[PDB]
Structures are given as C-alpha cells and as structure tokens.
C-alpha cells in the first residue's frame, strides 16, 4: 500500500540516559515483537544526549502503526525503569 520514512528524536539531560534508553530498546526489548523487527528498517541509537530512531517502511500502515506504537512504548518503559 504505502511507503513511509519515519524519524523520531528524544532529547535528554546527559549522554548516559540517551544510551541507557537506546540500549534498553535495542537489546532484549519485548514491546516490539521479532516479526515486526524483521519487517522493516528500524534503527534506534544514541546521538550524544538524544536517542535517534529512524524507520524506512513499505507495506500496509497496520504494521507501521504497530511498530511505532510498540517502539515509543518500549522507550516509555525504558525511561520508567531508569528514573525509578
């Protein structure tokens, strides 16, 4: 159906929080399933104090909607654990 170039950036205080989150999301995160991970180009990584996320999609928006919904949720649970 559609082509979708998505870019998300998350500002933080220090360089170690941006990393704590990007590691938390890239490694052993379960909010996004493996099938969606293996679907299209999802890239989460720190950039100093921001945690840049970039996706390049092609398909039906159903899988796109879910992938982002799952990823922002994955960053959310990541900030929630960090700041506890």
């Amino acid at each position: 159906k559609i082509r979708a170039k998505v870019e998300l950036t998350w500002e933080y205080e220090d360089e170690e929080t941006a990393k704590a989150i990007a590691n938390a999301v890239n490694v052993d995160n379960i909010s996004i399933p493996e099938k969606l991970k293996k679907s299209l180009n999802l890239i989460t990584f720190p950039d100093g104090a921001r945690v840049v996320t970039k996706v390049k999609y092609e398909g039906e928006i159903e899988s796109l909607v879910v992938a982002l919904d799952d990823l922002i949720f994955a960053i959310k649970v990541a900030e929630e654990v960090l700041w506890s």
């Binding site: 559609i2 979708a4 998505v6 870019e7 998350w10 500002e11 933080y12 909607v65 900030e79």
Partner: protein, 80 residues
C-alpha cells in the same frame, strides 16, 4: 523526557488518495480540542508530511497513534 520531535512522511499510491486522506485527517487535527503537543502537518503531492513536537513519550505515542490510525481508517474505508 525533555522534547520529543518526530517526523512522519507517508507516500500514498495516488494524488487523490493523498487528498482524501489529508481532508479526513485535517478535519480531526482542526478539532482535537485536547492539545497533547504541537503537530503541524501538510500535503506535499502524493505524500503527507507530519511533524509532531511532543513533551513526553505518552504525548508522542498518543499523537503518532491517532494521526496514523486516522490515516488507517481513511485508507480502509477508501478501499472498501
């Protein structure tokens, strides 16, 4: 969670689908009284350009969810 900038670009199969989806998502954006966090979006031909600037992750997830799911509904009905 400082600031949450997000840019979504969606290229649709036709110039008409991009209009229909824009026109249907516009009417929502133009309403949406609760203002979670700023989201200026425009139609650039066959493509739709979304540019959210949110305050937290809940605000981002919420905005992205709504706007893309509105697109989803618009696309769903559009192909029935």
């Amino acid at each position: 969670p400082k600031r949450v900038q997000g840019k979504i670009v969606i290229e649709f199969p036709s110039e008409d689908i991009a209009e229909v989806v824009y026109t249907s998502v516009l009417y929502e954006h133009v309403s949406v009284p609760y203002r979670r966090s700023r989201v200026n979006f425009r139609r650039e031909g066959r493509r739709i350009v979304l540019e959210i600037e949110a305050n937290d992750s809940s605000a981002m997830r919420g905005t992205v969810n709504s706007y893309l799911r509105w697109i989803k509904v618009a696309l769903d009905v559009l192909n029935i």
